[PDB]
C-alpha cells in the first residue's frame, strides 16, 4: 500500500480528537448504526463549520484551501471510530455491512466562499466553495464501478480490483481503464462476481444563476442522486475540481441543501374591521377598486380542500377573471400579487 507521510499520519490522530471532545458528534454515530441494524439512513454526518473552527484555527483554513489532503484523513478517522463503537460482533454478517466508506458534510457560514456561478473565478480552484443556484437539467442515474470482486474456479481464491477515476477521490489518481481481468497471473480464467462487487450511483446536474441576482455542472454520487429537481433553489457545497482551454468546470458536491409574531396576529384578529384594513393594504398605490381588492385576499388565502372517503377530491382555489379597458388597475395589479405571495410564476 501507499506509505503514509508525516503530515498524513498526524491528521488522522488530530481528526479523532475532534470527535472525542464533542459529544454531539459521537452520539450521532451510535444513533445510525443501531437504527440500521434493528430495521434490517445514509452514512453521512453533518459537521458544523463553527465547531471545527473553535477547535483549531489551522485545520479550519486547510479545509477551505486544499481539501484534497484533508478529506481522506477525515473519512478514515470516522470509519475507524465507527468500527470500534459496534460492540455486537456479527459472525455471518461481517463482509457486507463492513465495506462502505463513511462520508462527511459541512454546514455553516463560509465567509468569502459563498460566491455565484457567474462570479466563480479561477482563483478558487481546488477549494471548498458553496455555490448556490437553481437546477435546470438533471441527467439519468447511472451506476459507477469502484471495486470489482473476481473468483478463480481452478484455485478457489478471491481477487479484488479497485478502479480509480477522476470523479472518485479528490487526489489525482492513475486513470485505470474499465477492463475486467479475464485471466490471472498464473493463466487461470477469472469470473467476475457482481453480487460481492461494490457500486455507487452517479448523476450530473446543471446549476444556473438565479435571475433575481444577475452554468456549471455538479456531479452527485452516493445517496446524493435523485434529490435535485429542475426548478428548485438549492445550495450544493463541494470542491471546484477542474478536470479535462479544454478544462471542464466541474464541482464535486458533497451535500445539497434545498412567539412575538404569533401574539401580534391574535391581537389584531379581535377587531371587526380586519377585512377592510387588510384589503386596502395589498395595493396602496392603486386608488379605489375596493371590491376587486377584497377578492384577491380570499384568493391568496384559499379554501378548504375537501377530500371524500372514496377518493373523489374537490377543488378549493378561487379563479378570478378581469375583463375591462387596458391599463385600468390590471397590468400593475398583477405585479403586486407576484411580490406578495410566497409562490407565484409570472406567465
Amino acid at each position: 500500500f501507499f506509505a503514509p507521510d508525516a503530515v498524513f499520519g498526524d491528521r488522522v490522530r488530530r481528526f479523532q480528537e475532534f470527535l472525542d471532545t464533542f459529544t454531539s458528534y459521537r452520539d450521532s454515530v451510535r444513533s445510525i448504526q443501531v437504527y440500521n441494524s434493528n430495521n434490517a439512513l445514509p452514512h453521512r454526518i453533518i459537521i458544523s463549520l463553527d465547531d471545527l473552527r473553535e477547535f483549531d484555527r489551522s485545520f479550519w483554513s486547510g479545509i477551505l484551501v486544499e481539501p484534497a489532503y484533508f478529506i481522506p484523513p477525515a473519512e478514515k478517522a470516522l470509519t475507524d471510530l465507527a468500527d470500534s463503537m459496534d460492540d455486537v460482533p456479527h459472525p455471518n454478517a461481517s463482509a457486507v455491512s463492513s465495506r462502505h466508506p463513511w462520508k462527511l458534510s459541512f454546514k455553516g457560514s463560509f465567509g468569502a466562499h459563498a460566491l455565484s456561478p457567474r462570479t466563480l473565478t479561477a482563483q478558487h480552484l481546488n477549494k471548498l466553495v458553496s455555490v448556490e443556484g437553481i437546477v435546470t437539467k438533471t441527467s439519468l442515474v447511472r451506476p459507477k464501478l469502484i471495486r470489482s470482486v473476481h473468483y478463480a474456479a481452478k484455485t478457489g481464491r478471491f481477487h479484488y480490483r479497485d478502479y480509480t477515476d477522476a470523479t472518485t477521490t479528490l487526489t489525482t489518481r492513475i486513470p485505470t481503464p474499465a477492463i475486467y481481468p479475464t485471466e490471472d497471473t498464473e493463466g487461470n480464467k477469472l469470473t467476475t462476481e457482481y453480487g460481492y462487487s461494490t457500486f455507487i450511483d452517479h448523476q450530473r446536474i446543471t446549476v444556473q444563476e438565479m435571475p433575481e441576482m444577475a452554468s456549471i455542472d455538479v456531479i452527485l454520487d452516493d445517496d446524493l442522486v435523485d434529490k435535485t429537481k429542475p426548478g428548485d433553489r438549492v445550495n450544493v457545497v463541494g470542491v471546484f475540481k477542474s478536470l479535462g482551454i479544454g478544462f471542464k468546470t466541474l464541482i464535486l458536491g458533497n451535500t445539497v441543501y434545498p412567539d412575538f409574531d404569533i401574539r401580534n396576529i391574535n391581537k389584531l384578529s379581535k377587531k371587526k374591521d380586519i377585512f377592510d384594513i387588510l384589503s386596502q393594504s395589498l395595493a396602496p398605490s392603486i386608488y379605489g377598486h375596493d371590491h376587486i381588492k377584497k377578492a384577491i385576499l380570499l384568493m391568496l388565502m384559499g379554501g378548504v380542500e375537501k377530500n371524500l372517503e372514496n377518493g373523489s377530491h374537490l377543488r378549493g382555489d378561487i379563479n378570478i377573471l378581469m375583463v375591462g379597458d387596458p391599463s385600468t388597475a390590471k397590468s400593475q395589479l398583477l405585479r403586486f400579487v407576484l411580490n406578495t405571495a410566497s409562490l407565484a410564476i409570472a406567465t
Binding site: 462570479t119 479561477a122 480552484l125 481546488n126 435546470t136 489525482t172 446543471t206 479535462g244 482551454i245 478544462f247
Partner: protein, 402 residues
C-alpha cells in the same frame, strides 16, 4: 546568451519608472499600487501616454514586440509590492477595424466598438505539473505562451499524466467586437472579430455597450483566423457653439425644417422627430424599477407621402440607427439569435436589429404586414426595454433601450 543580459535592463527600467514618475507633486502609480493591496485586486492601470514622456526607447520597444515586454512588466510589478495584471490605456488615434492589414501583426492597436455577445468562462492552464507512470517523476512546466488561445502543441516530454490538483489556472473569456456603423460604407456588411480576456478582464463588459479596447493584433492556426488579445478595457470652440444655439428661441423651428427637406409641409410630423431623437430622462428608482425614457412614434396613412424617405433621413441623422423592414426581419433579426459553432460545438449568441442599436432609433418599414411570432418580442421591448430569451438552456437578459 545576449538575451539574458538584455532582459535584466528591461525589468530594472520598469521598477525605477514606478518609483520616479510623478504628476503635480503626486505619485499616481505608487498610490494606485499600494491601494490595490487592501482591496486585493491584482491589477494596475498604466497609461500608454505616460511612458512616452519618461523614455522614448521604452515606448518604442513596447509597441514593436509587445509579446515579450508585457510578460516582463508583470514580473517588475510583483517585485515592488513584495501575478499582477497589466492594464494598458491608450489615448491616441482610433484605428478602424477595416484598416487592419498585415502591417499591424504583433503590434499594439486601439479599437472602438460595441460588444456583440459574451461567451462563458474558460480555464487557462499556466503552471502545469506532469507525473510519470513508471518512475513517477513529478516535474513542473511553466507555460509562457502569452500569444495563444487554446493548447497549441502542449509540451509533453508520452507516459506523463497532467496533475489537475497541484496546477494553477486563470480565467479566460471570449468576446465579439463589431465596428462602429458610422464608419461602415453603404452597401457593405460590418464584420466582427473574436477577442480573449484574462484574469479580471472577464465578465466586465455588457453585450450592447460601446467601449474602447486596446489589444495586440495577431493570428493563430485553426489561411488563419485573426484574433486580438484584450489588455485593458476603458474642444472648447465646439462647446460654445452648442450653448449659443440652445439660447436661440427659434431653435424648435430651425431643426424642424432641417430634418428631411424633401418632404414639404407636415409641420406636426417633423416636430415629433426632434423630440424622438432627443428623448426623455432615464430615471432609475431606488427600489429597483426603471422607467421608460424613450419615445415611440407610429406612422400611418396612405402610401405616397414619402414614408420610406422619412425613415432613411432619421438613420442618416441619428448616430446609432439600424434600418429594418417588416417581413425581411424574423426572430433572429429583430431579437438576439442562438447560433451553434460548427468548430467548437458551442452555442454563441448573436446581436440583432434591436440589440446592436442600443440607445438609438430603430426605423422599421411595413409594420402592418408582419407576422404574429415576431410581434411578441416587440411588445416586450417596448414596455420593459429588455429582451428575455430562455432557449437552449441560455437565460440571458439584454437591454433594448431603443
Amino acid at each position: 546568451s545576449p538575451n539574458d543580459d538584455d532582459n535584466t535592463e528591461i525589468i530594472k527600467s520598469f521598477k525605477n519608472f514606478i518609483l520616479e514618475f510623478r504628476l503635480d507633486s503626486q505619485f499616481i502609480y505608487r498610490d494606485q499600487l499600494r491601494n490595490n493591496i487592501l482591496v486585493k485586486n491584482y491589477s494596475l492601470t498604466v497609461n500608454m501616454e505616460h511612458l512616452i514622456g519618461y523614455n522614448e526607447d521604452i515606448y518604442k520597444k513596447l509597441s514593436d514586440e509587445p509579446s515579450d515586454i508585457i510578460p516582463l512588466f508583470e514580473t517588475a510589478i510583483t517585485q515592488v509590492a513584495k501575478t499582477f495584471q497589466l492594464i494598458l490605456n491608450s489615448n491616441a488615434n482610433q484605428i478602424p477595424l477595416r484598416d487592419l492589414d498585415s502591417e499591424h501583426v504583433s503590434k499594439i492597436v486601439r479599437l472602438s466598438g460595441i460588444i456583440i455577445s459574451t461567451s462563458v468562462l474558460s480555464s487557462r492552464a499556466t503552471y502545469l505539473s506532469i507525473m510519470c507512470r513508471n518512475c513517477r517523476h513529478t516535474t513542473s512546466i511553466t507555460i509562457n505562451n502569452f500569444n495563444s488561445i487554446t493548447g497549441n502543441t502542449v509540451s509533453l516530454p508520452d507516459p506523463y499524466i497532467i496533475i489537475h490538483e497541484s496546477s494553477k489556472f486563470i480565467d479566460q473569456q471570449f468576446l465579439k467586437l463589431q465596428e462602429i456603423p458610422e464608419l461602415v460604407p453603404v452597401g457593405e456588411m460590418p464584420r466582427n472579430l473574436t477577442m480573449t480576456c484574462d484574469r479580471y478582464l472577464t465578465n466586465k463588459v455588457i453585450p450592447g455597450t460601446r467601449v474602447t479596447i486596446v489589444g495586440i493584433y495577431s493570428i493563430y492556426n485553426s489561411i488563419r483566423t485573426p484574433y486580438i488579445k484584450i489588455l485593458g478595457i476603458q474642444t472648447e470652440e465646439e462647446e460654445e457653439e452648442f450653448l449659443q444655439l440652445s439660447r436661440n428661441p427659434k431653435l424648435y423651428e430651425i431643426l424642424t425644417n432641417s430634418i428631411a427637406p424633401s418632404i414639404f409641409g407636415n409641420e406636426d410630423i417633423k416636430k415629433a422627430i426632434v423630440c424622438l431623437l432627443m428623448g426623455g430622462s432615464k430615471k432609475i428608482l431606488p427600489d429597483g424599477m426603471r422607467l421608460r425614457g424613450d419615445i415611440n412614434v407610429l406612422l400611418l396613412g396612405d402610401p405616397g407621402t414619402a414614408k420610406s424617405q422619412l425613415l432613411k433621413f432619421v438613420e442618416k441623422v441619428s448616430p446609432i440607427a439600424v434600418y429594418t423592414s417588416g417581413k425581411g426581419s424574423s426572430a433572429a433579426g429583430l431579437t438576439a439569435s442562438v447560433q451553434r459553432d460548427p468548430m467548437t460545438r458551442e452555442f454563441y449568441l448573436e446581436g440583432g436589429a434591436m440589440v446592436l442599436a442600443d440607445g438609438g432609433v430603430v426605423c422599421i418599414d411595413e409594420f402592418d404586414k408582419m407576422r404574429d411570432e415576431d410581434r411578441v418580442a416587440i411588445h416586450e421591448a417596448m414596455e420593459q426595454q429588455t429582451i428575455s430569451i430562455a432557449k437552449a438552456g441560455i437565460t440571458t437578459v439584454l437591454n433594448s433601450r431603443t
